[PDB]
Amino acid sequence: MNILLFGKTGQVGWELQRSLAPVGNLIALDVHSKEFCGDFSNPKGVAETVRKLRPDVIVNAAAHTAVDKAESEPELAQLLNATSVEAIAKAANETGAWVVHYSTDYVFPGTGDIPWQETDATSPLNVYGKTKLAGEKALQDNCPKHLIFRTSWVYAGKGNNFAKTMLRLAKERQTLSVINDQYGAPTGAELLADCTAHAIRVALNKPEVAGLYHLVAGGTTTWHDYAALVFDEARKAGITLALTELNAVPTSAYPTPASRPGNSRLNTEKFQRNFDLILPQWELGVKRMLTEMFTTTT
């Protein structure tokens, strides 16, 4: 059976190249796909390739995910995160194909404490989340044989993330400043991709699991304590990390163009029972990518 993949060079995407490889026959494409259209800024183009290949399963790891830039260029985010997905969905539903699609917790507003659920109310603080929410609604309404994975604080060892950018700073710098109020759960590309593969195989054999799932690594943490642990691991790996004065903060002290949510604690209890899958503590995943990075010899 035929799997079709977009956004193959991204974090998740690069990992789905590995994870989907045995699940079924894999065509993997990106923006720069030359013999085949993987360009999300052309909804009809990506719609044409879905129609053109007739995939059994479609994994969409392509997107517009430049959150702050999206506020400045929103109509483009709409094209990528709503319009192309909408088109992709409507195409998929003609061939009866499963559409797998990634979404975000930025769908939710802040308002902290209790962790967010799949049947909870949606009020996007920012554009990224408003646009992406449209995409998941658009998919929801054009193709019910869909799988939507709302995730958060996504990192991978190959591709830009918080731990990547945070570490670069820490090696260069003596004294550093970052957020301690934003509660949430860092989630690996590896986990996303591995669970995706297992989820697909369940869905094929049980269409009932079609729907919306909150899929994020276990537990919760702050961007601060996220970064602290990142440093301990750098430290642990003997690296002379320039940092001698680590400084915590509450959000609003430092500006960002888009409004970030304060309560990014997603509840995944649905995914676990539905797919019979485990979702381990966020740290483990993080230490794993860091170990691989700190193995620095060619």
Added chain:
Amino acid sequence: MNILLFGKTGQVGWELQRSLAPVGNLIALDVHSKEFCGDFSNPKGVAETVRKLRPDVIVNAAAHTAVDKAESEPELAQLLNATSVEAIAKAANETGAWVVHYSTDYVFPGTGDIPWQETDATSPLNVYGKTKLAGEKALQDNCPKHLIFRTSWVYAGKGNNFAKTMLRLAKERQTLSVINDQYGAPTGAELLADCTAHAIRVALNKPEVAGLYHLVAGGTTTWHDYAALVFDEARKAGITLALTELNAVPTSAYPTPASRPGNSRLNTEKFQRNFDLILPQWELGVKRMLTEMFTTTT
């Protein structure tokens, strides 16, 4: 459900840490496991931890795999590859636990051309293969709720392999010399680990798949052409690879302590239909680890 893993720091093993993480609750251990015995040179010790944790599933990625060294130190290979496995199996069967275990094509003799099957005859040319064959027979006879994965030419991006050692040479050297007669299929840790995860989930729900499976990447190739492609990829990634004169060879021109088989073409048609899984062409897997290696910035 509880998964138990040995040889977690090896090629396959490190990848199983990732792949098993969502399949079930994961205890991962090695030789140097301190609060828990992951030392295969003590069969009773590793037997004690199986009994001690009572795992639902046991993945054994630990082994003695130093093939030439094994000829010199065979009684030790027996301890690791036969004795400990035997013990592990017999323990597992008391708790009714699935034993997952990796084996080799070195189980087979040379005698080329036609690709090797699961119900074909076994005549190990070398010790490694003779010892490992004992282990898989020992497991076969103490624990029928087992999964045996005979693989070959196993590489990974973290841990020593042919492509790793071949490349080191090529960057250092002008003129280089390697084998073109040994036919076989390079197989990633990633693939091994990903398929293992899917296989476990099938086995739980269908005990009938218990048995012996040839699990190796698709197609076939020579160690020479393996290495050539490795260089093209190094070259392709702009690397000034010292190599100006690449030299092919037929086996016997260069000595090795152990006898290597000439026909390492494994047939995997059984695995594919039994697990409903795909086993893609060997190149893809290889290019993937190489791309990740040639992404050289921290």
